[PDB]
Ligand binder design. Structure first.
Ligand SMILES: O=C(O)c1cccc2c1C(=O)N(c1ccccc1)C2
Ligand SMILES: [Mg+2]
Ligand SMILES: [Zn+2]
Ligand SMILES: [Zn+2]
Length: 222
């Protein structure tokens, strides 16, 4: 599946994942994001795939957590990551993304996070943003895709550069760099070898095997 469902669940102390459903290419798909406790506030990673879903997520957070989202980071320019930024900004959330994400979202006519995150322009770059580490592994699902690690919980949020284990063929590669994607995954594996919980952009989370599985699928496409 049903469209417009929004919910969340706890992965660890102060770490949640939010799950929303929306339509892509005329079929209903799930989509994941992250919520991380940031003192008496919350950091949001990615929208819930649209204004309506994202407003519903803000209310779901009050039902289940009860702390204010004060900042949000979008991990690439696609509408399942930035659609809802306008709702967030009007609610008083400060929205962030890399300059590449902001530029590519503008070209697409998508909603545009307000603030630019410098320090993520070269593959392997990392910065801390409140309670998470932001990492640019290089081009993969998109040229701008970021991954997010929670150092205090060993949670790795792969975003849409990482596939769930049930997927056996590549999905949307319109914006991808298939030649670089395996190298970019290799950087993630090398940088976050202690990750205990790995979240794809779409579908079921798992362990570190989601990384090698994604490489397998991408190479088998090529
Ligand atoms: O990576 C994918 O193929 C994928 C799988 C499930 C759901 C989605 C995707 C994908 O690429 N999406 C998307 C949504 C809006 C704009 C561009 C891509 C949605
Ligand atoms: Mg097409
Ligand atoms: Zn995407
Ligand atoms: Zn996605």
């Amino acid at each position: 599946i049903p469209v417009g469902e929004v919910r969340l669940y706890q992965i660890a102390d102060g770490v949640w994942s939010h799950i929303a459903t929306q339509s892509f290419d005329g079929a209903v798909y799930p989509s994941n994001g992250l919520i991380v406790r940031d003192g008496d506030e919350l950091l949001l990673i990615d929208t819930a795939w649209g204004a309506k879903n994202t407003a519903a997520l803000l209310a779901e957070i009050e039902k289940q957590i009860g702390l204010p989202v004060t900042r949000a980071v979008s991990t690439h320019f696609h509408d399942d990551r930035v659609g809802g930024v306008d709702v967030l900004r009007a609610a008083g959330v400060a929205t962030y993304a890399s300059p590449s994400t902001r530029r590519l979202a503008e070209v697409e006519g998508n909603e545009i996070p307000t603030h630019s995150l410098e320090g993520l322009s070269s593959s392997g770059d990392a910065v801390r943003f409140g309670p998470v580490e932001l990492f640019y592994p290089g081009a993969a699902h998109s040229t701008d895709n970021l991954v997010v690690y929670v150092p205090s919980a060993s949670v790795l949020y792969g975003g849409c550069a990482i596939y769930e284990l049930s997927r056996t063929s590549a999905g949307n590669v319109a914006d991808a760099d298939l030649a670089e994607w395996p190298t970019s995954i290799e950087r993630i594996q090398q940088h976050y070898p202690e990750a205990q919980f790995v979240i794809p952009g779409h579908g079921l989370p798992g362990g570190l095997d989601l990384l090698k599985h994604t490489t397998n699928v991408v190479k088998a496409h090529t």
